């Protein structure tokens, strides 16, 4: 019973484990998309103002 | 003046990241990562403590959801503040 | 008794090593959660300074 | 008008100081190319996690 419940536990672990690597592969990407298009434009925009 | 003070505040995050703060030599980054991972490991172990294997009544560990998370947040705050992401990597 | 004891001596080993594998996955999940939380904190800092 | 021009010179010095602070703070957020440890390790999203 512990083995089958731990198989369910392994599924409940891997459902987040598989997603974590994928979202950390793209974790630089979306933050840099916010950087080069939203935050850094406001970083410049103070000085020409 | 307030944003100059903001500049003064934000000119120390990377400055504190520059120094390799080191407590036993093993840096504080490695010890803090190990301690924070130990706390998160306790959190996941309470998540993955087998309910049917528990001899007593099942304990809904929402206090372990909250207070252990806050202690983990304090440890992670210290870890990120004192250390750079590169040697974190 | 012998037939049960051989399999139980193997089953304690199975339980210990499978819990070791579980704790390895737990440590990996902890490290990934820490790294993702650091990314989220960096994103919040970026938005606040913005 | 002379005092006005002197104080506009003062405020222009203030604006140059503001632009100096802005330029000082650009290099932390234009730091997107962290492909090395030599460059200050500012943000984690500027790295490559591979």
Swiss-Prot record, chain B:
| Intracellular or extracellular location(s) | Cytoplasm, Cytoskeleton, Microtubule organizing center, Centrosome; Cytoplasm, Cytoskeleton, Spindle
Query: TM segments?
Result: none
The family this protein is said to belong to = Belongs to the HAUS5 family.
Describe, as the record does, how this protein assembles with itself and its partners.
Component of the HAUS augmin-like complex. The complex interacts with the gamma-tubulin ring complex and this interaction is required for spindle assembly. Interacts with EML3 (phosphorylated at 'Thr-881').
What the protein does comes down to: Contributes to mitotic spindle assembly, maintenance of centrosome integrity and completion of cytokinesis as part of the HAUS augmin-like complex.
Protein name per the record: HAUS augmin-like complex subunit 5
Organism field? Homo sapiens (Human)
- Mapped onto the parent protein, the portion here is 148 to 244 of 633
From Swiss-Prot, chain D:
Record's signal peptide = none
The subcellular localization recorded is: Cytoplasm, Cytoskeleton, Microtubule organizing center, Centrosome; Cytoplasm, Cytoskeleton, Spindle
Q: How does it assemble?
A: Component of the HAUS augmin-like complex. The complex interacts with the gamma-tubulin ring complex and this interaction is required for spindle assembly. Interacts with EML3 (phosphorylated at 'Thr-881').
Give the UniProt family note. Belongs to the HAUS3 family.
Q: What is this protein for, i.e. what is its function?
A: Contributes to mitotic spindle assembly, maintenance of centrosome integrity and completion of cytokinesis as part of the HAUS augmin-like complex.
From the Swiss-Prot or TrEMBL record, give the protein name.
HAUS augmin-like complex subunit 3
Q: Which organism is it from?
A: Homo sapiens (Human)
Q: Which residues of the full protein are shown?
A: 152 to 201 of 603
């Amino acid at each position: 019973q512990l083995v089958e419940e731990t198989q369910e536990q392994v599924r409940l672990l891997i459902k987040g484990n598989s997603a974590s690597k994928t979202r950390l592969c793209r974790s630089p990407g979306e933050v840099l998309a916010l950087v080069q298009r939203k935050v850094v434009p406001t970083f410049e925009a103070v000085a020409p103002q | 003046q307030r944003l100059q003070n903001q500049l003064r505040r934000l000119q120390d995050m990377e400055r504190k990241a520059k120094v390799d703060v080191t407590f036993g030599l093993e840096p504080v980054v490695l010890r803090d990562v190990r301690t924070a991972c130990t706390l998160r490991a306790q959190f996941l172990q309470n998540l993955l403590l087998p309910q049917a294997k528990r001899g007593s009544l099942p304990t809904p560990h929402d206090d372990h959801f909250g207070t252990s998370y806050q202690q983990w947040l304090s440890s992670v705050e210290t870890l990120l503040t004192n250390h750079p992401p590169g040697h974190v990597l | 008794k012998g037939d049960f004891d051989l399999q139980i001596a193997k089953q304690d080993y199975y339980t210990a090593r499978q819990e070791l594998v579980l704790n390895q996955l737990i440590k990996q999940k902890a490290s990934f959660e820490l790294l993702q939380l650091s990314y989220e904190i960096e994103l919040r800092k970026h938005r606040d300074i913005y | 008008q002379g005092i006005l021009n002197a104080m506009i010179t003062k405020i222009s010095n203030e604006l140059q100081a503001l632009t100096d602070e802005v330029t000082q703070l650009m290099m932390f957020f234009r730091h997107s190319n962290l492909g090395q440890g030599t460059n200050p390790l500012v943000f984690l999203s500027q790295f490559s996690l591979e």
